[PDB]
Design an enzyme around this catalytic site. Sequence first.
Site, short mmCIF file in Angstrom:
data_model
loop_
_atom_site.label_atom_id
_atom_site.label_comp_id
_atom_site.label_asym_id
_atom_site.label_seq_id
_atom_site.Cartn_x
_atom_site.Cartn_y
_atom_site.Cartn_z
N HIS B 41 0.81 -1.22 0.00
CA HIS B 41 0.00 0.00 0.00
C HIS B 41 0.85 1.29 0.00
O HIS B 41 0.29 2.37 -0.16
CB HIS B 41 -1.09 0.01 1.09
CG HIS B 41 -0.61 0.20 2.49
ND1 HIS B 41 -0.52 -0.86 3.37
CD2 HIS B 41 -0.26 1.34 3.14
CE1 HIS B 41 -0.12 -0.34 4.53
NE2 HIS B 41 0.07 0.98 4.43
N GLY B 143 2.03 6.15 10.13
CA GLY B 143 3.43 6.03 9.75
C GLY B 143 4.11 4.76 10.25
O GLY B 143 5.23 4.46 9.83
N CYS B 145 3.24 1.70 9.53
CA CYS B 145 3.16 0.58 8.58
C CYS B 145 4.55 0.09 8.20
O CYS B 145 5.47 0.90 8.04
CB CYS B 145 2.33 0.93 7.34
SG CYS B 145 0.60 1.37 7.68
#
EC number: 3.4.19.12
Lengths: 304, 304
Positions: B41, B143, B145
């Site tokens: 993503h 942030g 991820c």
Amino acid sequence: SGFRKMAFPSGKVEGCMVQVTCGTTTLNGLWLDDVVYCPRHVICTSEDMLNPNYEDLLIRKSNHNFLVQAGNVQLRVIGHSMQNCVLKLKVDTANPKTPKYKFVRIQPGQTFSVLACYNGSPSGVYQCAMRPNFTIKGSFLNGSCGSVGFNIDYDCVSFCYMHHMELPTGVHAGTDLEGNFYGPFVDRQTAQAAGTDTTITVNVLAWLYAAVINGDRWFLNRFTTTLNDFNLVAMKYNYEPLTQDHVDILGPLSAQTGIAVLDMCASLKELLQNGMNGRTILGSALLEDEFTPFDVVRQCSGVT
Amino acid sequence: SGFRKMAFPSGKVEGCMVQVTCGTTTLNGLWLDDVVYCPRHVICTSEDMLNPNYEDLLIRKSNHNFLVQAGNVQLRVIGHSMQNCVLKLKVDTANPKTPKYKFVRIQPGQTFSVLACYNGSPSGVYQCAMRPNFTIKGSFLNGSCGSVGFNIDYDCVSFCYMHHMELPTGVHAGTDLEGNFYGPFVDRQTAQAAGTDTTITVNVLAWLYAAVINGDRWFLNRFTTTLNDFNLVAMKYNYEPLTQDHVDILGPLSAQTGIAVLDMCASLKELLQNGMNGRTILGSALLEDEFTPFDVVRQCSGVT
Ligand SMILES: O=C(c1cncc2ccccc12)N1CCN(c2cccc(Cl)c2)C(=O)C1
Ligand SMILES: O=C(c1cncc2ccccc12)N1CCN(c2cccc(Cl)c2)C(=O)C1
């Protein structure tokens, strides 16, 4: 979202752990620059630990009697001295992995990360608080002496604790990195009173603010209170009295949630008087006090 | 003595964290050898995340569109591919800090350490379990991820989780290091049912054994039970059914304490039926299920 007892990343400290042996005793040391710091009780035998005369014991020891090993390689000891309850062993090699560091004496109620170590090798990392009675509720086994507590400010490691002892009650006692014990504890195998351990009120309030930010809002009520009225309740439940310095520190949390500090105090008062009624807050069924207002803001803002 | 939610020392993983940017999106990547692993993503925009066609989105991207930064230095991307929900960015430099590692898909009920990261920089470390409903109750902000979950076996790091998503309920979902989501979750900004989250019975029993080893023995009773009788009680309280494989794994803990697994089951049954009555076990007022039998033995034996 989510709230966990988070420790600082331990890498900078792992690169400092060494094993120190003296006679038959092995424990952990902290290698920073050309100095290895360790608990002075490394020079003791089991017959000496009832009432050791560390000055006399250290006299029978020379540089070559202190075996310092960093991983698989032996460090050469070229000097030894006692500073309070720690020994400082000067080695001929500066630790190439020495981070930017400071030695600090923390205040009771402040938090820190512990890197539990055995034979100079790290086994785990956990977060804890220095209790108002200057003990820590750690997790330590035989051989963990010399394991350290620290905080990290961007790149700087502030070492605040060195593990020395487990009291007969299962709680832990140790020193700052200058060898001064937190509390009245002595490095002697004798019965020692820890003292009444109160709840860190400013930390419980910070954690209630963390709960509100995380969606857990059942405990919020239609009431407010005063500092003096709240402190009457805090005394009954062995909670530290809340001061205006504490209210000031909760300012950013109060501003983020729009809940006045005294309104949150009234919620805490009702929780103390009525209990949780089988409900939970942030996955806990008791009021948590090992998160400072700084920790809550850090975990809710993402400071790296 | 003492029992804490202990994480593995994070150093070996800190040396693997990098920042990956694509377009306007920045998250964390894991650099092992000459490959950077990150959630796919990273190629999405906010208008794309409602129902992204990752294959079509990735087509508009070239090697030079993936910005990988390790500390202050930029890594040169010479290849890119999608494996399930992760991207693998081939860089021209092998990470000199790559530890001995493995990629493993953990079983629900197993534990692991998470190194929460932001902009490729580690902020904290905490221990957690993969829930039976394949979610994790982590602590993650915007942030985070690409932050990873792992276990350490002496020198080998077994990476088991990569953080991808926060569900509207506040729980977290992610993949193994091959990009396969744990659970039925998809990397799409849509409403997704986590499912009923049961209690890890074998872990609660392990933690009750930890309590007994640590001196907390109030919950022990004069009763025993059978696997089938216990499982009738476990079903009522949304606890995982206990199997003979679970009883076998509790063997060393049963042997160390001299308390038969079924006797401990009867204590757990009474605790479920009667509650704690305002009492605590290992500093907790609820039954803890994020410690496996391996974790209890490790924390009570000192494996480094
Ligand atoms: O290695 C430990 C130790 C440490 N932490 C937790 C433990 C849990 C179970 C068993 C042992 C330990 N010791 C030896 C030194 N030692 C001590 C005794 C008296 C004085 C001084 Cl300074 C130190 C101890 O208290 C106990
Ligand atoms: O960066 C995060 C994020 C991560 N973890 C916890 C957070 C808590 C507060 C706010 C943001 C986050 N995001 C962006 C991607 N993102 C997503 C949305 C849909 C699909 C996919 Cl694969 C991913 C998110 O869920 C949320």
